[PDB]
Ligand binder design. Structure first.
Ligand SMILES: Nc1ncnc2c1ncn2[C@@H]1O[C@H](COP(=O)(O)O)[C@@H](O)[C@H]1O
Length: 343
């Protein structure tokens, strides 16, 4: 299915920096070991400062990744917080539209913005893993659960189903060469947690990182985020959201409960909760504010919407891959999400 895999830095430029080189070289070797030919797009390794300063270079890399028929899959390096800045370089003169096609695209976090970009252009994408975060796992092997989904994707171009992991892991405090070959701290995973509504619900999934979506509507982080996202109509129409399942997950920022609440209400203000078929929420990173987020969801989300919490999707580890734009059936009782590529 996949032979050449192209690595893009569309958010932070970290993967080019000396201090992560040991991690990068490890992931490169793993991709090779999986039967892939990993290539870095021309600007992807230019480092933090260059990539921050040149969103146009990022856009160039993405356009090239889609345009180049030899590239079978696009893997995001890592998230960040400013990929919105690519919008004019992708959309002003239909630059991305001109080259766009159905090709595997995988990332999470700030990449949420890019997922919305690609959705706009009619592309089905894949949420929930990145090169640095998953492929460069510092233990001897990739996390088993994560690897299950990655290998499925590269072998079949699809994810058939998601089931909960048996365990979850803490985020590392040490990513230096010293950490090589050392294991993450493990916890028992208690599975999908049906907070409210029906245990069965269906629809195509779209969403990603709550913090990312919030910057569509709240210009605190970047003063022109809302302007750019409005100009380019990045947030889907409510007729588009109608009958979809929204995914939400929280980042390493670990918003305090009152800020989580403010984010959910800001989303509510879009009208999205009136039209969706259900809500999937990832386990918070490190389970930080796990209980508080649960309470906030129960307090705020419209009463008619089913909510499944504690998915192994997002910033906690290990990490499932979630197809976007593919009909899903969620069964909270049986603890499975099944995908139907024909629907
Ligand atoms: N050097 C690193 N190596 C591996 N994972 C990292 C590194 N830096 C950050 N992460 C993790 O990558 C995940 C996604 O980061 P981000 O895309 O920036 O939200 C988070 O859970 C981070 O803790």
């Amino acid at each position: 299915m996949v032979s050449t895999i192209g690595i893009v830095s569309l958010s932070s430029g970290i993967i080019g920096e000396d201090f992560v080189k040991h991690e990068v070289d490890l992931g490169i070797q793993r991709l090779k070991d999986l039967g892939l030919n990993p290539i870095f797009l021309p600007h992807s390794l230019k480092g933090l400062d260059f990539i921050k300063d040149h969103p146009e270079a990022r856009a160039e890399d993405l356009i090239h990744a889609f345009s180049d028929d030899s590239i079978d899959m696009i893997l995001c390096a890592i998230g960040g917080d400013d990929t919105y800045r690519l919008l004019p370089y992708l959309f002003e003169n239909d630059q991305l539209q001109k080259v766009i096609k159905q090709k595997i695209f995988l990332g999470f976090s700030d990449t949420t913005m890019n997922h919305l970009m690609l959705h706009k252009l009619g592309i089905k994408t894949f949420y929930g893993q990145s090169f640095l975060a998953d492929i460069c796992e510092l233990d001897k092997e990739m996390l088993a659960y994560s690897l299950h989904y990655f290998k499925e994707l590269i072998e079949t171009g699809r994810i058939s189903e998601i089931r909960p992991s048996d365990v979850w892991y803490e985020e590392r405090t040490d990513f230096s060469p010293t950490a090589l070959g050392t294991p993450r701290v493990s916890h028992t995973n208690t599975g999908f947690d049906l907070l409210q509504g029906s245990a069965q619900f269906e629809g195509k999934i779209l969403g990603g990182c709550l913090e990312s979506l919030y910057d569509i509507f709240d210009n605190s982080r970047y003063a022109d985020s809302t302007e750019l996202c409005q100009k380019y109509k990045l947030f889907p129409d409510l007729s588009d959201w109608e009958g979809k399942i929204l995914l939400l997950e929280t980042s390493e920022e670990k918003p305090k409960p009152e800020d989580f609440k403010k984010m959910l209400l800001t989303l509510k203000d879009t009208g999205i909760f009136a039209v969706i078929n259900g809500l999937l929420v990832g386990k918070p990173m490190d389970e930080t504010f796990h209980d508080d987020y649960k309470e906030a969801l129960l307090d705020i989300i419209d009463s008619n919407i089913p909510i499944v919490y504690n998915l192994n999707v997002g910033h906690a580890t290990p990490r499932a891959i979630v197809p976007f734009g593919v009909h899903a059936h969620v069964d909270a009782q049986e603890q499975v999400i099944l995908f139907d590529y024909n629907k």
